[PDB]
Amino acid sequence: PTINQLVRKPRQSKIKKSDSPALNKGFNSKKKKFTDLNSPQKRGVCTRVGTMTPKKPNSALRKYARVRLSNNIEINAYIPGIGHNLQEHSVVLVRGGRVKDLPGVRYHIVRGALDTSGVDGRRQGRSLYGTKKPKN
Amino acid sequence: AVKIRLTRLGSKRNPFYRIVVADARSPRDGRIIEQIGTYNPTSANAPEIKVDEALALKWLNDGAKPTDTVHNILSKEGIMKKF
Amino acid sequence: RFRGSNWKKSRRLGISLSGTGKELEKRPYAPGQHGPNQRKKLSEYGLQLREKQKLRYLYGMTERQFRNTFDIAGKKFGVHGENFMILLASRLDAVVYSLGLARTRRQARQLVNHGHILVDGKRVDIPSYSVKPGQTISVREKSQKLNIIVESVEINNFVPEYLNFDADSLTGTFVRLPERSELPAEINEQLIVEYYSR
Amino acid sequence: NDRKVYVGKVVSDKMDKTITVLVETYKTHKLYGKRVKYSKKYKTHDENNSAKLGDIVKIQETRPLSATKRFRLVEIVEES
RNA sequence: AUGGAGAGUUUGAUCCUGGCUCAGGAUGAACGCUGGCGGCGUGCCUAAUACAUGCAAGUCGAGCGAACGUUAGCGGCGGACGGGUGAGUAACACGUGGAUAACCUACCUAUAAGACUGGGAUAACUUCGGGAAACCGUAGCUAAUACCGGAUAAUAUAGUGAAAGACACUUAUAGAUGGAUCCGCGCUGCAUUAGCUAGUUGGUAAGGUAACGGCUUACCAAGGCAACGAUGCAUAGCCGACCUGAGAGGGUGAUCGGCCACACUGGAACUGAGACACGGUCCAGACUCCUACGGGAGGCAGCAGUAGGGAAUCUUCCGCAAUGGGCGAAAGCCUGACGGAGCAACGCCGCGUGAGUGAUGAAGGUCUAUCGUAAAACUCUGUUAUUAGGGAGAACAUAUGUCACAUCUUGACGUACCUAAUCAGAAAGCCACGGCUAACUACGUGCCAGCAGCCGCGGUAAUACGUAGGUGGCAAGCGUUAUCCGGAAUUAUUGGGCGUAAAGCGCGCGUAGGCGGUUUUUUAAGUCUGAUGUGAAAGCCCACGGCUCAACCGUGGAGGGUCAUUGGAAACUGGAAAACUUG
């Protein structure tokens, strides 16, 4: 803890990397290179539906979504809830980041969000997987 | 070339203004070096005319004359016509 | 004002704390979903949120609108804990809230709907004001008082200091901001405005 | 508003008065506070005189009257 | 110095830790929801996009060549224009002091040399003409306070231009304008870039910019460098702003820019009361293009709008009236500078959509007394809504009579404060629904779907889930969107380990220098601190006054932060003489 060589030679900070690096980004075609944006809002347009089986910690069954973002790369999602949207090819409002217990996926759906409304079997949630005009 | 200016931070509810010596080719708002004070031309806020223009009335023989319909404020005074 | 319904609030808050109440036409013990069971135990955060159960029903001391004078005069005099409890009831909606002209808790704020308009100032038919040294809720502009507010001229006397009703206006505003005594009993100071700063 | 008495020492020189004086000062950085001493180089000039092998002198900030050189002052300590 | 209590983290366990997820918000912060209204404000932040056009500083003269100052364009203006920004540079582009032994000038104001003498040409009227037009040819022109001899005009210590209405001209000269000729600290990162550029060192040129001078050139020697960042070199504005710390300030500097890089493009003969010029002037380029294909030259980094990319990403509603730039001895303009706004519940507020309420009150919705002091059906406020008159500010002007200055000259929004009688014209709906992040119980559910902000839940009592009456926060507000702040003491300028997390020399060796005996020290610099300069701030360590309080303005006592003077204390890092010696 000696200060001579401290202006001769400095120190570092910690070492951390931020969250969702292949997110918060809008891929170019005119100038071909991405934008570092951290946008509030964004879209999702669909390529498949997707589902993998081996689930230990829950040990029930539920699928997810394989939705591609701009212009030739693998981007993957998951539908956290009791609502099955047996759909695809949508145009939505993204939710950024991952919910607990799925590795590598960081992209999601807001309730409603211009494509569908949601799993309409919900009426008590009034704020989960599709819930609009709910008597409070 | 010299003209009058004013300051701006946040109030009105009565036509207010200020006294200063800015440039000619510019708007009502201008930079002020020797702050002399402000001016209240709302005929209601008499306690706001604390302008001590000491370097603004020294343009009499330097370069100044009533312009832009502002002679009414100088009409009450008479520190000119020295030539 | 109300924002719902209240009078189950015997076991939610303490009480509105400046009246008689609508507490016990029934079993007033169990607060919610405990009817065949024990009481509610103690904490600080259970304590803190009990405090603010007896702040947001006590008055219309709504969050994100009231702590503000606490931090505002956090540059003015004294550890602001009891300053707050005398900074949420040192208004003309409080120098006239203990004045006893209301029968709904909203009618000390609604003392001026068409009641007390111009307290040396401009007609203001509102709940609150800026109750500085000697600041009332005084007589109406083109009226004086109404049959829903002047119907309780001194509906209870001995209304606090700085609420010294010189009547037919139904308000008293003797001196200044009020010494926080003549207000809720079982309340504290470091559990009014020392729970909020975190 | 006058002109200082900037001083220093000398290092080397080339044909027909490519003269110079050293510049230095007492001061520190804003970050990690040590009394480390520091310098930068200057540009004075003579006929050929104020030069290498001992010219502890003064310098000036005036009109240079010079190519990119800047100084006219020599106020000395001594010679070798 | 108005001083730092965060959710849970260890193996199995107290214990020294270990930082994560994470918090609350604040963001030009909004998306589904929800869409009582607004005070005032900002939104090509999608793409410094290609274009539905024009759009923009503009018109005129008792001083001047058409008509009963109209009709010129000489002359003046403009042209570098308001506005648009943060495409482009590590740069005096940027905030402040500043040698001027690097500077001057008409616009703001008074003037001053005088107002003498001049010729006469050019715009229009076009005078005369070929031909898709209009592009171009003949070509006297008629004047102008002017294109314009000549006198001395001032710096020989010997430099010229003035052609005034009426009871307005050109010069010796000025205070000034952007600036700045420039000085200084302002003036970031990349060690995967040191044997240093030939001009590296600086003197020496005919030259010249209001401006010294390797600035091109003028003459010669480099080791000038030198292991210290030569140099390369990547974003390339700064600075009143905002969240903010206790304080050092610490970062982003977008509404808000006072200063500068920048107008299709490379230039550009030009020029200016201020230059290579955003609707100029020409000639090279690739663009949607206009053209008897004279060949036109235009692009909204200036309001719109079009195909758009679109989390949202706006009114072509109006036209000078809030300031006159310019033209004018004058009455007058253009505003697209500045204005008038669908307003986006974007900021948050001004407060309004129920009352006197009510005996526990029912026909009971998780539970099986709970939110039930639920209800009804009675009354209370104007404040939303039927109308109404709606004139809030404020002083404008040769001849009016003789730069202090002024009347027979200032209502699109010019109707606001709208008390106003006033019915009852509801304040969408809240999350998880246990305990922490604050929450209440359960039928559906038998692992079938499935709960879940770090902790964390359904396999036959989800005090989590599907759903259902709400208590903790709430009523213009519900879950989410992600940015740095004290918090993060996971920068350590205040607040950094050495054997052990995640950490100590292969060492004989060892340049630069960070440090670097005792005592007196010659120093009289600096610190001790300070006379001074006391040169302004709108507001400062503060507070307050105008204002239906909130959108919009102000007294500045805190001297403007060694700024216009260098100090006395030698106790010392500091021009630095030695002695002590056993270390």
UniProtKB/TrEMBL annotation, chain A:
Keywords: Ribonucleoprotein, Ribosomal protein, RNA-binding, rRNA-binding, tRNA-binding. GO terms for cellular component: small ribosomal subunit. InterPro entries: NA-bd_OB-fold, Ribosomal_uS12, Ribosomal_uS12_bac. GO terms for molecular function: rRNA binding; structural constituent of ribosome; tRNA binding. One of its GO terms (biological process) is translation. It comes from the Bacteria. SUPFAM superfamilies: Nucleic acid-binding proteins. CDD domains: Ribosomal_S12 (cd03368). Gene3D superfamilies: Nucleic acid-binding proteins. Residues 1-54, 117-136 are annotated as: Disordered. Part of the 30S ribosomal subunit. Contacts proteins S8 and S17. May interact with IF1 in the 30S initiation complex. Belongs to the universal ribosomal protein uS12 family. NCBIfam families: rpsL_bact. With S4 and S5 plays an important role in translational accuracy. This is Small ribosomal subunit protein uS12.
Automatic annotation (TrEMBL), chain C:
The keyword Secreted does not apply. GO terms for cellular component: small ribosomal subunit. Signal peptide: none annotated. Gene3D superfamilies: Ribosomal Protein S4 Delta 41, Chain A, domain 1, RNA-binding S4 domain. One of its GO terms (biological process) is translation. It comes from the Bacteria. Pfam families: Ribosomal_S4, S4. One of its GO terms (molecular function) is rRNA binding. PROSITE patterns: RIBOSOMAL_S4, S4. InterPro entries: Ribosomal_uS4, Ribosomal_uS4_bac-type, Ribosomal_uS4_CS, Ribosomal_uS4_N, S4_RNA-bd, S4_RNA-bd_sf. Residues 1-89 form the Small ribosomal subunit protein uS4 N-terminal domain. Residues 90-154 form the RNA-binding S4 domain. Keywords: Ribonucleoprotein, Ribosomal protein, RNA-binding, rRNA-binding. Part of the 30S ribosomal subunit. Contacts protein S5. The interaction surface between S4 and S5 is involved in control of translational fidelity. Belongs to the universal ribosomal protein uS4 family. With S5 and S12 plays an important role in translational accuracy. One of the primary rRNA binding proteins, it binds directly to 16S rRNA where it nucleates assembly of the body of the 30S subunit. This is Small ribosomal subunit protein uS4.
From TrEMBL, chain D:
One of its GO terms (cellular component) is cytosolic small ribosomal subunit. One of its GO terms (molecular function) is structural constituent of ribosome. GO terms for biological process: translation. It comes from the Bacteria. Keywords: Ribonucleoprotein, Ribosomal protein, RNA-binding, rRNA-binding. One of the primary rRNA binding proteins, it binds specifically to the 5'-end of 16S ribosomal RNA. Belongs to the universal ribosomal protein uS17 family. Part of the 30S ribosomal subunit. This is Small ribosomal subunit protein uS17. It comes from Staphylococcus schweitzeri.
